[PDB]
A paper describes a structure:
More recently, AZE synthases have been discovered in bacteria, namely AzeJ and VioH, which are involved in the biosynthesis of azetidomonamides and vioprolides, respectively. Interestingly, they show sequence similarity to the class I methyltransferases (MT1).
The amine group of AZE forms hydrogen bonds with the hydroxyl group of Tyr175 and the carbonyl oxygen of Phe134. Strong cation-π interactions with Phe134 indicate a protonated state of the nitrogen atom in the AZE product. Based on the atomic insights, we propose that during cyclisation the positive charge of the sulfonium group migrates to the C-N bond and accumulates on the AZE amine. This charge distribution is stabilised by cation-π interactions with Phe134, thereby facilitating the subsequent cleavage of the Cγ-S bond, which ultimately forms the neutral molecule MTA.
Numbering used by the authors:
A (entry chain B): 13 to 245
B (entry chain A): 5 to 245
Write the structure that this text describes.
């Protein structure tokens, strides 16, 4: 199961500590941040729900839009950092956190605001062997999602190999596929990249319409609407 | 006549072989640096769209930390840095992302560029990212130079909160700044180092006062626990489309 590696004491910390990031990770994070900001404005989302938020990697986006924020992560320590930041930034009335599995939240959690955008950041979707389970759950509590994945360029694969080595992923193996590159590790680590075509196809199969699609050397970022989601203001 | 007079100007530390690399390597960043970088990225993106800037000039761009902003707006981009290795990385990325027609780089002192450089596009926004302004003991000459080739600037600085000062101390130690000293001041804490390293933070009030003294009007101001980011217009810059 996808949650196995991130239930390990230092699974999340090793993956999300900036100290383990090659410089070339930054353009993926920057594209995703800008797309999330623009999507929330255009689709009139009053709430941002960040799945796998760690220490609140998208909190600043909600802050600049005066939107509600919910961060969901399994990492208790990273959530305490986020809780402290929310308090010190005077955002207690607008921002909250939950320590839970993201699938528990998407299937069972209460609504955040009236029009919530769900962010799947920094290749979160790529950590799922069966991603349809997560994508199918989004429609219930959201009018929109932003999905950020690693691409399948030679440079993307090289950056990822360097990244996952620095994180100290054990039994790290590279598996070249048609529609992306899969990395596996011995402690249940799983991460795949996506071709633009494979990502679009997967999203269509789960009833998610692509409104915006951005690509750089390292990443694909898409803004999607559920089929049957209200498109109003 | 004098052995070291004129040798500790802002450019001195960044003319050292590994000066730029040590400061701009993402691995040396505490996690709490990321909200500063995210806020300035969002403000730069929004400013360019609203003010109809067709060009982004990133001063101290390193490997092209704001290239993605220009790319997502289909804007022209110029990256200015003293670091040849980081500019080479940026040139490769520009080629591979098919931006050779609209993105360029210069290896030069940012002050040489702002004083003597040709215009970029028709309406350029100048980005002073990641506390660049704070590396100057006397920043007024840089701010005074901005009006000539720009209709707008985004200025990103560390704030003077207890947390900001602690994050900066951790950050500068991870960069391996030698003889690191912390100088507490009301309007922004100053860190110094052995090889000419100088970095100050700014209070909201001090940053606003400095910008006004240099004829730069704040039109948007954002703050978090760690940082202040402002969008400024020069007094007399055209504000058309
Ligand atoms: C951005 S993907 C990595 C981050 O997402 C978090 N994460 C990954 N999978 C889950 C999950 N199933 N439930 C909650 N948080 C998760 C990890 O703890 C880490 O902070
Ligand atoms: C964001 S401040 C650090 C970055 O700005 C660059 N930088 C600092 N001062 C100058 C300067 N005077 N001219 C050019 N690049 C500079 C450094 O080389 C580094 O990439």
């Amino acid at each position: 199961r996808e949650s196995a590696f991130y239930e390990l004491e230092f699974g999340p910390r090793t993956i999300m500590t900036l100290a383990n990031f090659p410089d070339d990770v930054l353009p993926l994070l920057q594209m995703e941040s800008l797309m999330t900001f623009e999507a929330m404005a255009y689709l009139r989302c009053d709430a941002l729900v960040e799945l796998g938020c760690y220490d609140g990697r998208a909190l600043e986006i909600a802050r600049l839009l005066n939107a509600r924020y919910l961060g969901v992560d399994l990492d208790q320590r990273a959530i305490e950092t986020l809780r402290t930041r929310i308090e010190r930034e005077g955002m207690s009335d607008r921002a909250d956190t939950v320590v839970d599995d993201i699938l528990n939240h998407t299937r069972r959690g209460a609504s955040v605001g009236s029009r919530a955008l769900y962010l799947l950041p920094f290749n979160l979707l790529g950590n799922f062997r069966e991603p349809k389970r997560l994508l199918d759950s989004l429609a219930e509590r959201s009018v929109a999602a932003v999905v950020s994945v690693f691409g399948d360029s030679a440079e993307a694969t090289r950056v990822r190999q360097s990244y996952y080595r620095r994180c100290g992923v054990q039994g790290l193996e590279l598996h070249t596929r048609d529609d992306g590159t899969v990395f596996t590790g011995s402690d249940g680590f799983y991460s795949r990249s996506y071709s633009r075509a494979c990502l679009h196809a997967l999203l269509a199969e789960c009833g998610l319409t692509v409104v915006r699609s951005a690509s750089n050397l390292f990443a694909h970022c898409v803004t999607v609407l559920p089929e049957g989601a209200d498109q109003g203001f």
